[PDB]
Specification:
The structure is a homotetramer.
Chain A lengths: L1 H17 L3 H13 L5 H4 L1 H12 L1 H19 L8 H11 L3
The structure holds zinc ion (4 copies).
One zinc ion binds next to helix 1 of chain C.
C-alpha cells in the first residue's frame, strides 16, 4: 500500500543517513531473527521496535524511533503528533485511508 | 557560557526524553572513562562523540548526534545548518560570540 | 548466601576485566531501571539478563552470559552444564544446597 | 593455516552467541571496510576497532574475551588480547 511504501522507504533513507551500513546491519538482524524486512515497521510496529531493541539495546532503539518519527514529520509534514512508532503508523494509515 | 549552558541542558533533556536511565548511564560512562560530564559535548565535541561511540557503538552515537542537532535547532533556530556535533558547537559559539 | 556471594563476585570481577567503566555503567542502568544491583543476577537471573539486553542488546547480553558461565565453571566445577544464567544459578543452588 | 584457523574459530564463536550474529557482523565489516572476518588475523587492531563501532567497546571487549577463550579451547596458550592471539598463532605455524 502507499502508506506502507512511504514509511518503509523513509525509514531506509533514515538508516542510510545514520551510516552507510545500517540498512544492511538491521536487515541482516531482521531476516535472521524474524525472517522479515524493514516493512515490519508498518506491519507490526511493536515487533519492529522489540527487534531493534534486541540488536542495539533499548536506548539505541528509542533513539531510532525518535529519528524515524522526526523524518516522517519532515516528509509528510502535516499534523504528525505521534510519540511512538505505533502512533506514527496509526497516523499514516489515517492520512492514506488504510 | 550561554552556549555551553544551552547545549548541555538541551542534551540532558534529550537523554531524559529517550529513557529514564540514559542520563545516569551515559554520565557513569563519561565519569569512569574521561572524568567528565555531559558538558564535554560543548568542551570537546569530538571526544564526546568518541565516548558515546565507545558506549553503544557508532550507529547509536550517530543517532544521538542527529537527535541532539534536531533538538538544538528547535531550541535556537529551526535551521542551524550543522550536520555534526562539531559544526553545531562551532555555530553556537558564532551565535553567542564565544 | 555462599552461592549468591560467589556469583556476584564472579560477575563483578568479569566486569572489571572487560573495562574500567563497565561496573559503573551496568550498575547505573540496573539502579535506574530496576532499583537493583548486580546481585539481581542471582536473585532473578531472567530479569538480570533482560536488563542487560535492554542496555546493550541481546548479542552483547549473550556474550556477557557466556563469559559469566565460563568464569564460574573455572571456579566451581569444570563439569557444570549450564547454558544460560538461569541454569547456572540453579546449579549453584544445588551445589551449595541453597 | 593460522589465518584459516582463527577465522573458522571466530565464526563458530559468533554462532554460539546467536543465529544472526555472523550475518550482522559480516554486513557491518563489508559495508565499512569491504572486509570479512579474516581481518581479525590480517589486522587484529583494526578488527577490534570495527567491532567496537558496531556495538561499543564493552561489547567488543566481551567478544574478544570469548574469542580468546574459544581459540585457546581448540588450540590448547598465552594470550589476553587479539593482537597477542594472532601473534601466537603465527609462531605455531611459522607465519
Ligand atoms: Zn534493503
Ligand atoms: Zn556558563
Ligand atoms: Zn550471603
Ligand atoms: Zn579472562
Amino acid at each position: 500500500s502507499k502508506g506502507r511504501d512511504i514509511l518503509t522507504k523513509t525509514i531506509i533513507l533514515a538508516l542510510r543517513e545514520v551510516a552507510p551500513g545500517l540498512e544492511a546491519v538491521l536487515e541482516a538482524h531482521l531476516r535472521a531473527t524474524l525472517n522479515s524486512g524493514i516493512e515490519l515497521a508498518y506491519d507490526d510496529p511493536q515487533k519492529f521496535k522489540e527487534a531493534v531493541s534486541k540488536l542495539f539495546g533499548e536506548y539505541s532503539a528509542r533513539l531510532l524511533e525518535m529519528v524515524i518519527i522526526s523524518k516522517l514529520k519532515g516528509r509528510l509534514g502535516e499534523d504528525i503528533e505521534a510519540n511512538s512508532l505505533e502512533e506514527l503508523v496509526s497516523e499514516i494509515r489515517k492520512i492514506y485511508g488504510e
